[PDB]
């Protein structure tokens, strides 16, 4: 695959180390096996009877034979374990193939250009482009008679991103299910994006089988209805497969988010209260022919002014402030009485029960209440915002939508498995013809590179 | 009352919602009833004998009959409760009158100008003035043949603030009892302000009976001595009344400040260490014909440079910091020994007693010690302060006086009931003739509006 | 001593108060007596038997006679105590001499210039110079026929600092023992500075006996070998003395740093993680003829931009952050399991043992991991840095070396007693002729002032 070569030469530098990639892979596999074995051990070896005393943990550990009969007790866990083992095996094989390819890629990189591994981090990736250009000037490889230039190098790596950006600009990709009382909703979890990628670009059932070029069948105008019907049955079967596979990935996501959330639960909610970017922003804010690293730099430099503009010109709300004041005072009065009682015997056994709950109410109330130039912040934010999707109300709502809250995004990820087939069935199938029309009328064929969207030029 | 109409049309917008006013009032009444009932319940239903164990709280609750004899046991509590009920019902009746008036005020507002309740928050109150102007141009009401101008609208609402600002800039209002060693003290608690308001502007014994016009009796030059004698009698009887009523309001203030302080006691003293504005600043630093909202906005904008100037250019103190260093080292050494003893049995039962005290000493010592352009901060503060009451020492002392500490202000509020009659007797009575002369020679009469201080123009 | 007069007149103002100096000294004496008595009391009066219960502390205190035979039990403690008492007596006598001289100089200061003690903090020390100049104009003292100028006044106080700055600029003074794998090491603990001061400038064995003029013997070219041999035997005997005295000063430093560290141990490591200046910076960054207060002010203003430049342009570390991510994820998983086990009996007695360790590992992992214009910061730092000792790698390494870590400096101070004779033996003795030549060829004699280094002019 011609595109895969450039994609891998980019990914090697972007992962700044071959050993880094190897460690990433091996420790990802070790991760997955750690979660599976630790969950099955906690659910299949831990005996609550001895622990609850209703003592050294080694003594509390039941003998291995008892674990043998206890794991024999249920057959469903055996099927779960064998499925997990098969998944681990297939990912292991794919990863071995990937690292086997990448080592030879790095060997070719060293032979062609001879940059030592310790010097890779110092290179700003512009000299990589310059060295590749000089390689074409010296005729290292016969990659077309006309030497490759910057636009072609960018296109051969970013064709799929260009199509996805154009399709999102048209407005079809972001889910826009109508809210009952009024408003627009957005749903761009990793599950939906993966489904779109498997449906459109990569895979055996993809329209772009291999992604080299658009097949001639879709150029014909008359066969569009038959091709739309074929796509309809394809999306129906894909939705059926996703619905079949939903519960297992749901459980996996539940375990992973449980670990991630309880890691931060002990820590202060300040990190939990922070807000990062969302995938909708990473989709609607990507210029044509743009690498991921430049996008990351732009959002990194635009993070602070956007946050300042968000927290400076928030719309006022009197009723919320009044209610917060009354709740915080009542919580404070109850805490006053309770603490005065507590200070002067430790054997109450009932006060300490409500102490934590009342303190939690006080802490949420204190942070919920508000306390004591929007135009300049908006201007300096838009200086890096570049594109953009009561005027102040609309602007604040849009800025809030483009920059979601962390727990909101995690809840979106958690709810993705259940919503995986529903949106595919309800939002894509009825509007089938116009997407095929968009591919038909917005594709441009060029010599050498091949298929490029008209919106890229 | 002509002034009351404009005052209420201002207050409706400033409370940004009729439902907001209704909820605030009803929940303030619920506030007071909750405080009284909870205090009397804790004093007359809590049984320390069973709770101290010398267990579910519901079991600890004594039967209602026993509470009946216990509340019957003392007659003083009955008088306290009946007085509280009388105060509650009087305030209830006043509040019902206020909300009944305000509902028809809002109805008239809707009929005249037709702004829905949701759109009130969006209006910057300038369009309110413009619409009222257009109403005069369209002849909505026959409020004098000459249409009302902006200065007149401001004056009819702000006459009392103008008089109070003039009287404060004369130097009479802020009580300035001399310190024994030296210096000037300022006392402007809410109690003294309420006393001045009840004496001068609002009430049956006020000089301004109704606040419409100055009575012609005070214009005569020959009667000034008799009028001063009458004012002396009035201030004596007012001081007697306030001295009679002092203990009950003192107890109420004690309860309220107890709740407020213990609400923040568990939280970090960072909020307790915060600095807020004082009423003396809100009186001396207020221009003529000035609305409360613009003053609040100006002080909100000027808050931060004032704090920066206060912290940057603090006067040096060698002896203070050196003694602080000694105390912090001694506390640290004692903490060292005590912790080393503690880490290696939990049954010491005497170490934990000194634990908290020594920790508190360490925490106060560490925060009390000092650690590593004043002109620019002073300039940017004075650019917003507009007015202003070793040069650096004098400037810093004035900036500290105009911006008090939170606990200092709360202590002033708590000490107000005892200080209520003392200052009225010792500070106002001897210098009555000059106050009478100030009212005599600083009032200018104009057509339509009426009585205006010469310092307003 | 002519120089001592100006040195004391500077130190009086720099310590901003005679009473301050007197109390600081008497509290330093009480300081040392407190450490010695408290340490010997804890080691020779505390009975672990009764306290461990294997109760009021007063009951736990053994009788005085018991402490009598318990201190009689071992003989070396008596020698330690008598040596400490003699050391305290020596410092007490020296301190009495210093305060006796300082009262006399303060009396002369009042008689000649008449500034009250309260006004000393107000003067910026420039008026002190002006008043002294006026004193020579009026002929108060016959200090040479030619009136004293600013340069001469600065030299008579800063001759030793000038020589030390020249020596450090030559590169000899800071020890630069070579690392085994490679790199440069710096060691400028107070012990080495005291040794070089006692060997070069102040002391009976100093080359500058009294610090008034350089002896004529060192000017002769032919005697340099014999003088170098004398210096070599002197450094050998000095190293022998320091090696003999090493253990006691080591123990004293251990006790002092123990108290200092355990004072901050309970507090958050934010103060422990703070960055402070190092003596190497205070040595290489000092211009010729600069007083200590000017240097302190310069670094006070340059502290912040240097810190910003340090935290902004840190070199990337892929392997470090990847390992940190893996460790923090594993620690979080173990913390998850431990916490969910703990939430639902307090009689476990084994989980709580690893609770603190696992939490500490999680905290160090989260603190260690990295998270999301260097040229401007470097420029604004160099604007105040004036002098200066992959270009970015070299610049960051220099900025890191020039500004050490706090705990690193304390560890350097702790390790100084063991390294005290080793560097003096290994680094100074072989290079003796070159240092003798350095004094010989860069000493300039001037009328009145006397000896000034060639690099001062």
PDB file of N, CA and C in Angstrom, chain A residues 95-132:
ATOM      1  N   UNK A  95      -0.363  -7.169  16.485  1.00  0.00           N
ATOM      2  CA  UNK A  95       0.696  -6.326  17.020  1.00  0.00           C
ATOM      3  C   UNK A  95       2.074  -6.842  16.625  1.00  0.00           C
ATOM      4  N   UNK A  96       2.252  -8.165  16.614  1.00  0.00           N
ATOM      5  CA  UNK A  96       3.514  -8.741  16.157  1.00  0.00           C
ATOM      6  C   UNK A  96       3.763  -8.367  14.705  1.00  0.00           C
ATOM      7  N   UNK A  97       2.726  -8.464  13.868  1.00  0.00           N
ATOM      8  CA  UNK A  97       2.878  -8.048  12.476  1.00  0.00           C
ATOM      9  C   UNK A  97       3.247  -6.571  12.378  1.00  0.00           C
ATOM     10  N   UNK A  98       2.596  -5.727  13.182  1.00  0.00           N
ATOM     11  CA  UNK A  98       2.863  -4.292  13.136  1.00  0.00           C
ATOM     12  C   UNK A  98       4.306  -3.981  13.513  1.00  0.00           C
ATOM     13  N   UNK A  99       4.787  -4.558  14.617  1.00  0.00           N
ATOM     14  CA  UNK A  99       6.157  -4.277  15.044  1.00  0.00           C
ATOM     15  C   UNK A  99       7.177  -4.879  14.084  1.00  0.00           C
ATOM     16  N   UNK A 100       6.874  -6.047  13.509  1.00  0.00           N
ATOM     17  CA  UNK A 100       7.753  -6.632  12.504  1.00  0.00           C
ATOM     18  C   UNK A 100       7.889  -5.712  11.300  1.00  0.00           C
ATOM     19  N   UNK A 101       6.777  -5.124  10.855  1.00  0.00           N
ATOM     20  CA  UNK A 101       6.850  -4.154   9.767  1.00  0.00           C
ATOM     21  C   UNK A 101       7.629  -2.909  10.183  1.00  0.00           C
ATOM     22  N   UNK A 102       7.367  -2.398  11.389  1.00  0.00           N
ATOM     23  CA  UNK A 102       7.956  -1.127  11.801  1.00  0.00           C
ATOM     24  C   UNK A 102       9.463  -1.223  11.988  1.00  0.00           C
ATOM     25  N   UNK A 103       9.973  -2.372  12.439  1.00  0.00           N
ATOM     26  CA  UNK A 103      11.422  -2.506  12.564  1.00  0.00           C
ATOM     27  C   UNK A 103      12.101  -2.396  11.203  1.00  0.00           C
ATOM     28  N   UNK A 104      11.541  -3.054  10.186  1.00  0.00           N
ATOM     29  CA  UNK A 104      12.100  -2.945   8.843  1.00  0.00           C
ATOM     30  C   UNK A 104      11.945  -1.528   8.303  1.00  0.00           C
ATOM     31  N   UNK A 105      10.847  -0.853   8.650  1.00  0.00           N
ATOM     32  CA  UNK A 105      10.677   0.540   8.245  1.00  0.00           C
ATOM     33  C   UNK A 105      11.778   1.409   8.839  1.00  0.00           C
ATOM     34  N   UNK A 106      12.085   1.210  10.122  1.00  0.00           N
ATOM     35  CA  UNK A 106      13.148   1.985  10.753  1.00  0.00           C
ATOM     36  C   UNK A 106      14.507   1.648  10.151  1.00  0.00           C
ATOM     37  N   UNK A 107      14.719   0.379   9.795  1.00  0.00           N
ATOM     38  CA  UNK A 107      15.972  -0.006   9.147  1.00  0.00           C
ATOM     39  C   UNK A 107      16.119   0.707   7.809  1.00  0.00           C
ATOM     40  N   UNK A 108      15.042   0.745   7.019  1.00  0.00           N
ATOM     41  CA  UNK A 108      15.072   1.473   5.753  1.00  0.00           C
ATOM     42  C   UNK A 108      15.300   2.963   5.978  1.00  0.00           C
ATOM     43  N   UNK A 109      14.678   3.525   7.017  1.00  0.00           N
ATOM     44  CA  UNK A 109      14.878   4.931   7.354  1.00  0.00           C
ATOM     45  C   UNK A 109      16.347   5.213   7.644  1.00  0.00           C
ATOM     46  N   UNK A 110      16.968   4.358   8.458  1.00  0.00           N
ATOM     47  CA  UNK A 110      18.381   4.515   8.792  1.00  0.00           C
ATOM     48  C   UNK A 110      19.257   4.392   7.554  1.00  0.00           C
ATOM     49  N   UNK A 111      18.976   3.401   6.706  1.00  0.00           N
ATOM     50  CA  UNK A 111      19.792   3.207   5.512  1.00  0.00           C
ATOM     51  C   UNK A 111      19.665   4.388   4.556  1.00  0.00           C
ATOM     52  N   UNK A 112      18.455   4.923   4.398  1.00  0.00           N
ATOM     53  CA  UNK A 112      18.235   5.983   3.421  1.00  0.00           C
ATOM     54  C   UNK A 112      18.796   7.316   3.901  1.00  0.00           C
ATOM     55  N   UNK A 113      18.574   7.661   5.174  1.00  0.00           N
ATOM     56  CA  UNK A 113      18.885   9.006   5.636  1.00  0.00           C
ATOM     57  C   UNK A 113      19.863   9.079   6.803  1.00  0.00           C
ATOM     58  N   UNK A 114      19.998   8.019   7.604  1.00  0.00           N
ATOM     59  CA  UNK A 114      21.032   7.910   8.636  1.00  0.00           C
ATOM     60  C   UNK A 114      20.923   9.037   9.669  1.00  0.00           C
ATOM     61  N   UNK A 115      19.810   9.021  10.393  1.00  0.00           N
ATOM     62  CA  UNK A 115      19.636   9.829  11.593  1.00  0.00           C
ATOM     63  C   UNK A 115      19.634   8.887  12.791  1.00  0.00           C
ATOM     64  N   UNK A 116      20.555   9.044  13.738  1.00  0.00           N
ATOM     65  CA  UNK A 116      20.633   8.117  14.876  1.00  0.00           C
ATOM     66  C   UNK A 116      19.386   8.199  15.736  1.00  0.00           C
ATOM     67  N   UNK A 117      19.053   7.125  16.463  1.00  0.00           N
ATOM     68  CA  UNK A 117      17.797   7.129  17.233  1.00  0.00           C
ATOM     69  C   UNK A 117      17.730   8.222  18.286  1.00  0.00           C
ATOM     70  N   UNK A 118      18.868   8.604  18.869  1.00  0.00           N
ATOM     71  CA  UNK A 118      18.851   9.644  19.891  1.00  0.00           C
ATOM     72  C   UNK A 118      18.612  11.024  19.293  1.00  0.00           C
ATOM     73  N   UNK A 119      18.903  11.202  18.006  1.00  0.00           N
ATOM     74  CA  UNK A 119      18.738  12.489  17.341  1.00  0.00           C
ATOM     75  C   UNK A 119      17.350  12.687  16.745  1.00  0.00           C
ATOM     76  N   UNK A 120      16.485  11.671  16.796  1.00  0.00           N
ATOM     77  CA  UNK A 120      15.161  11.793  16.191  1.00  0.00           C
ATOM     78  C   UNK A 120      14.321  12.854  16.891  1.00  0.00           C
ATOM     79  N   UNK A 121      14.390  12.912  18.224  1.00  0.00           N
ATOM     80  CA  UNK A 121      13.593  13.884  18.963  1.00  0.00           C
ATOM     81  C   UNK A 121      14.009  15.315  18.649  1.00  0.00           C
ATOM     82  N   UNK A 122      15.281  15.531  18.309  1.00  0.00           N
ATOM     83  CA  UNK A 122      15.753  16.877  18.010  1.00  0.00           C
ATOM     84  C   UNK A 122      15.275  17.368  16.648  1.00  0.00           C
ATOM     85  N   UNK A 123      14.969  16.460  15.732  1.00  0.00           N
ATOM     86  CA  UNK A 123      14.543  16.863  14.387  1.00  0.00           C
ATOM     87  C   UNK A 123      13.126  17.425  14.455  1.00  0.00           C
ATOM     88  N   UNK A 124      12.865  18.600  13.887  1.00  0.00           N
ATOM     89  CA  UNK A 124      11.514  19.180  13.919  1.00  0.00           C
ATOM     90  C   UNK A 124      10.573  18.684  12.829  1.00  0.00           C
ATOM     91  N   UNK A 125      10.909  17.579  12.158  1.00  0.00           N
ATOM     92  CA  UNK A 125      10.081  16.921  11.150  1.00  0.00           C
ATOM     93  C   UNK A 125      10.033  17.719   9.849  1.00  0.00           C
ATOM     94  N   UNK A 126      10.514  18.963   9.872  1.00  0.00           N
ATOM     95  CA  UNK A 126      10.672  19.699   8.623  1.00  0.00           C
ATOM     96  C   UNK A 126      11.909  19.225   7.870  1.00  0.00           C
ATOM     97  N   UNK A 127      12.989  18.947   8.602  1.00  0.00           N
ATOM     98  CA  UNK A 127      14.171  18.374   7.975  1.00  0.00           C
ATOM     99  C   UNK A 127      13.890  16.983   7.430  1.00  0.00           C
ATOM    100  N   UNK A 128      12.913  16.273   8.001  1.00  0.00           N
ATOM    101  CA  UNK A 128      12.504  14.994   7.427  1.00  0.00           C
ATOM    102  C   UNK A 128      11.944  15.205   6.026  1.00  0.00           C
ATOM    103  N   UNK A 129      11.076  16.208   5.874  1.00  0.00           N
ATOM    104  CA  UNK A 129      10.553  16.545   4.555  1.00  0.00           C
ATOM    105  C   UNK A 129      11.670  16.968   3.613  1.00  0.00           C
ATOM    106  N   UNK A 130      12.610  17.781   4.103  1.00  0.00           N
ATOM    107  CA  UNK A 130      13.709  18.229   3.251  1.00  0.00           C
ATOM    108  C   UNK A 130      14.567  17.057   2.785  1.00  0.00           C
ATOM    109  N   UNK A 131      14.871  16.125   3.692  1.00  0.00           N
ATOM    110  CA  UNK A 131      15.670  14.960   3.329  1.00  0.00           C
ATOM    111  C   UNK A 131      14.934  14.076   2.335  1.00  0.00           C
ATOM    112  N   UNK A 132      13.623  13.893   2.523  1.00  0.00           N
ATOM    113  CA  UNK A 132      12.856  13.115   1.554  1.00  0.00           C
ATOM    114  C   UNK A 132      12.859  13.788   0.187  1.00  0.00           C
TER     115      UNK A 132
END
